[model samples]
Target: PLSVQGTGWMSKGQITVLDMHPGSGKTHRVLPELVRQCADRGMRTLVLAPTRVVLKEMERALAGKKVRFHSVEGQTTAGAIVDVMCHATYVHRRLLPQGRQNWEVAIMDEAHWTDPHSIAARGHLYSLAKENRCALVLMTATPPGRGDPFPESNGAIMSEERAIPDGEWREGFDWITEYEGRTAWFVPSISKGGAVARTLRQRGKSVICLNSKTFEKDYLRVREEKPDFVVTTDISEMGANLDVSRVIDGRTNIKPEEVDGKVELTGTRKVTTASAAQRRGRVGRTSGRTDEYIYSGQCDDDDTSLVQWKEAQILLDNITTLRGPVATFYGPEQVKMPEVAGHYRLNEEKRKHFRHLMTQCDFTPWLAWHVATNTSNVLDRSWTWQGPEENAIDGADGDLVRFKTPGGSERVLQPVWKDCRMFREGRDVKDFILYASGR
Candidate 1:
């Protein structure tokens, strides 16, 4: 086992951001130490990974380490043991309140993927973190460069003080970066539409194709070719294990879409760039294999694509946030009101309206406590009673009235009326609203 002290400084009560690269032994060098620290403090730790595969890897690493964990991926035994919840499962639950009381430490692996600029990824990570009061630690390899959109959040721009020595760290086997002697053969559509198929037949290359729902049919058709070269889209991209000497970007017969008032590659998305890179990296893995690209368009200047630039910007912005000053020490601290002369008076009026809204909705005081603490999901679309149900009511043919929950197992509320008994009883209404909101 590697010495933890040699890698970097470790401390409790403060966020520690680590910036590492793929195959840098981050999991081996840092994760064990982190888990040990958490265990020593008697803190339950929750590890969040970007994908199921990574989560499983973490589980394997933590096994027999005296730390108990349960994943939200079908295994949901939330007993005395520590818990690991999948982001998807966490989001699907309707009743669980967000907070750190359940776990002491939360580790977000591949933190770069949750760049705030990206709406979907940002929303999920941020909401979960804010709700959970656990001490947050983010790990990532791809650091954002200067002038990028999210620099602070990427890895706090922190120095790599605890990197494993090149010799000690596992090399190409863990992750491969440099591929030597790879050749990519590009087949121009004009010369031969079936050039790739013909060459594969001759070379006996195993071809594979990624399909939506017709994989069985497609597989049979490709196998019939008995070609030496195998073509596959599924095995061509990120983290894929494939060996191929050439890539044929057969020009699609379809037309391009209009982008920025010009006809661009239609239906081209961010996945295309990732796919191409995966295909390009396939060769030279087996040693002495030459890679080639056969395409009409020049591949020399394909250093960065639009998607890559966007991803880079998103990461840069995140790093910038991570490096910023810690505005509040306590995660549950509420927002302070401005000291402006008239603002407080006006704000009081708004608060009263908010109070009334809460009372009418019968929101639980416990839920209210979350809102008052400013710990609710920042981007929750259903924050103020406007949700899918509300939209459905709006689209209803008849007049619709909204009801408020009184909090509790029943979790339902009676409709608000101008002269309803509950509404007339102001004190009771306020208390009920606060209690129901969980304030």
Candidate 2:
């Protein structure tokens, strides 16, 4: 496995994909070996995970005698062997001044989820690695759409021939036919699932995965107290190392969609096949003796396509950090700039002005452009506040407010729009849902 992973760096290829099963030791065994090999060859490594929880697990896995692994936010010590972080942190720091650094090898763990929608940012990282003659490794159990239409600027198709066979990867559990009679579907909600988990907790430990915030406190307690049961959302659906005897999940296919310029939940209540597979893989990892239950209407077809990124958000990230090697390849496609410019009418002068406001107000391009071109004068006195006071624009009600600058001056600004997935609480999440669904 180590040799196969190093093949790209050892040969002419620059990007390599490793599609292995969940408990195939992709992180603990395979990754640590690769990191050690790189350090033995006096080469630096950059490891990117999908979430902070995954990063914490990586810290535990990479703790070895051969090399020192450092979890970094920006820069690391000169003696560190591998610099690790989440994808969002990497992209955020990369946009800052003097954040781009060189590495001999870059490993993207859980590649399917790491940069799914942050395509342009991932694509930019890809270009930078290629330009610097670095090897790129994408490791994931559930490869997205067979991993071809991934966020690669070069549009190179990723081959699955190198993938390790699914079965026989471990000795613990049977991947096939193990959950024949043990699995239950169409369960109502997390509350119902929690009842099953609570009953199972009397026998052994259990973990719950639900898309509700009602049990968030319970989830935190489970994580901290090592209780009989723990509940979480998609936050732990992938790349989490929870070795429990039972798993309860309430994930459904009902995702937020844009309707009449607002977001609403309108998909089928069935659980996506991809999500179900990932959830099932959660248990039977260590003990091979576990049970599975789901709260879904039915099982839908596997989601094959990767998340589609908005062109404006991509342009915003690139235009704000336009200088040096960062500007060379910021888009996933070569024609992205022209198409975005044509749609947004972003000429050189307009881009200059946008950049100025983007950095000055610390706002995303969508909000900056919206603030610049907004002509509405309607103001609703009754509006709920979301973020800091400095990000508000006057007379814009829920949409805009006046930013209280440091110089005792005020600037009209529009709040940055976010997906409902960003919130945790039921009311906070439902607030955005009702705004779009008009419920």
Candidate 3:
């Protein structure tokens, strides 16, 4: 504990964004320092997190270090001035101070959400920090928005990712063939997190699943014991450090694909490059975290030679947002026109968002049937879309490709077709079940 610390884009006079990599460990140094400096002086300290998972993690981590803390969303911190509150809860419940005692400092962790509303809320948080000219610390690996990732009104870059060592990318992986951290067997929906947990116990492996709907008891358990493994629905990604040994993501979102001429539902998901990095960082902190990627056979691919990019990937993978006021390894283009080397399912709205480089974290399908109705196969074609309409096909649903067939509906023009066709051509219930359950 030799005054541990890491890099950041810190500023002392005003607002700042400390764009650190996922596990830079800056909090260990800054957080305690803030506590000792402010709390010891009996000034006050306010910590904000975007979710309970993170807010509670802060309280847990600080407490484990013998640092006394209070939580505003709980039963123990009534008059406790030094407390942590969920940031979203702050705005949703309109928890504004009535000119109460001015805060000593306000520290917001994982503080990046870019929807119009989120930006407005962040501005509001900043205003409250000004209530007593208190120090403000905004930390995030991914800062919101693109094209000048800074506030013209005020604020400066405190710290940015600069190849930090023994911090962000400090560990190595142990990729065993039969990875212990995996769904070794198949399961149903993510809602069956409890089922997964129960099933693993048969093998003497201990785990706990955490969802917004069910986690209080488990978090209580966490109070008395450190978890060996934890299954989370993106909640753990928000600054919670469990030193996980591995990750097996069983969650998939309901997305409307143009299925058989109707907007039917199906399990759809894509781990963004940013998100993938975050998940990967979770492991190898203490020992190693195994990533059990679904080896999706070929469903996510397009015609063997061409990989199909989802609408979000088609756009988002190209956009780049730098942390400092204006510096970058490459000029920060709104959405850098990435060379489309393969077919892609286009979502006009997302493409427009990419051009200006804006995205939301609301867990929206990212691909959907808005006003545009047409659907077709990128089966073998490449296209671009912009404007109030989708792919210039918004004239009518008829022009869009929704539910429409393309390239060829021969039921034979595919690599997946070849494998599955053989199934229909020559297979048994066992074959289908085996394949289906493997994922």
Candidate 4:
């Protein structure tokens, strides 16, 4: 147990970093001992969580077992005191109070999620930590880089990870199907649900669309009456208390929106690796249940890797069941680069060594957008065409898609890439068809 060691260090108000795999259960060892030390030191402890959901969960889990914690739901950092104070008070400056000190130790959970964002708030607290002489503890499963926008630590990392067998860990993660059992398939949006429902049912099984509410009404409960299997991407629409058998992730990417200061599945949202794990983790509760990932002509290799890479870097396989090769199948065949007719080669002098630098790339849409573009905005990347005048390209039904540029030229977009852009933007045949069907 690292409790004795951790407590001794905490007593001295030293900086400590905990790096362990997700499921390793460091909380059991660390939190209890730290709370105990906070008692002996005659000072209160503070906990900063990654999000409000996490803050609430920590409050729920530590109830009765730990101190009489005061949640910062409508509370402030320097307000009245309690046994343990917890909140997602890392990003905003107004949450930090002055005049006097309250907490002697500030323990931040899910530190990997804090970097890049919330660092400004973190920096403020760090300055406070120095003046007041407090212990700083950062806990996370994955420590990717030195942190893109991280505050400098004391130049040390205490890392520990348990080795997992490749075979067993990779088992049950293969693409799965059966004669009769419960299952789910994850897709970007419910628009693709109709096609998937048609395709999977041909094999003789029950199917239900979890988000099939027609999108024009109150879409909380299941849209299908006879529910057994489900197709979904919105984790907010699901219930934790419900039991399920099998599952599949269609591997779609969409951007999300904020509702009432909280991130809800309002519309476009990207399906990152961390989120994919959360979506696929719904099944395997009871015996004989399976969670299969979608493999079709529609799925792409680039988006899959983008989300997959996020998982390996952000999740670090702690206790998260969602890990490894995202889809059970691949398609260097399923997807082909859209015939982008834009002869607009990049401005050579601007890129300097553009062609030379790309000589060793794998040639994916994202790669083209990142290394080829003038901006990093979601849909505002550079084109793959060599320049002067962009060439003509097709849309979904071989329709020509033309975009007017600042350079006074009309550049036609590729049907495939253009269709992707349309899908991600929440516009497509699916949106038109449902309303057009007049159901």
* Candidate topping TM-score: 2
lDDT of 2 by residue, 1-439 (tens): 5446434563322666777766778887887777777767767778887765566677777766344333423464556656777765565454444456667778877765522223444465566555665777777765544222112211122111122112122333232124333222212333344454454444444434443343323333444655444444444555765544444444453444433332333433445555555665555554333344333234554432212233334443433344444332222233333233224434444444444434443334443344333312212111223434552433314554344434444434323443333232243433332322222
**Backbone N/Cα/C clashes per model:** 80, 7, 16, 34
How well does model 3 score by local distance difference test? Answer: 0.37
Which scores better on TM-score, 2 or 4?
Answer: 2
Stretches off by above 4 angstroms in model 2 are: 2-12, 64-81, 114-122, 125-132, 147-229, 248-251, 265-271, 286-308, 311-439
Residue 366 lDDT in model 1?
21
Candidate 4 local Cα displacement, residue 3, angstroms: 7.9
How would you encode candidate 1's per-residue C-alpha lDDT over 1-439 as one tens digit per residue? 2223432322333344566433344655567567766666667676655444445566777665564443421333444344444433332221122221345566665554421122223233333445444455666543222122112221112111122111112333221112232223322221132334444334434434332122334434443553334444332222222334444443222112222322232332222332333334344333342344443221222223322233222222222223223222112111211121121111223333323333344432222222433323332213334323322222123444333443333322222111122222122444434433445
The RMSD (Cα, Å) of candidate 2 is 11.2
Worst 10 residues of 4 by lDDT: 328-337
Collision pairs in model 2: 392-401, 392-402, 393-400, 393-401, 393-402, 394-401, 394-402
TM-score of model number 1 = 0.38
Instruction: Compare candidates 2 and 4 on lDDT and give the better one.
Output: 2
lDDT of 3 by residue, 302-352 (tens): 111111112222322222112212211111221322333122223444333
Q: Tell me, what's the RMSD of every candidate?
A: 17.7, 11.2, 16.2, 16.2
Residue 143 of model 4 has an lDDT of: 37
Model 2 CA lDDT for position 291: 42
> Which runs of model 1 end up more than 4 angstroms from their true locations?
1-13, 66-81, 93-101, 114-132, 144-203, 207-266, 269-439
Worst ten-residue run, lDDT, model 1?
329-338
Q: Which model, 2 or 3, shows the larger lDDT?
A: 2
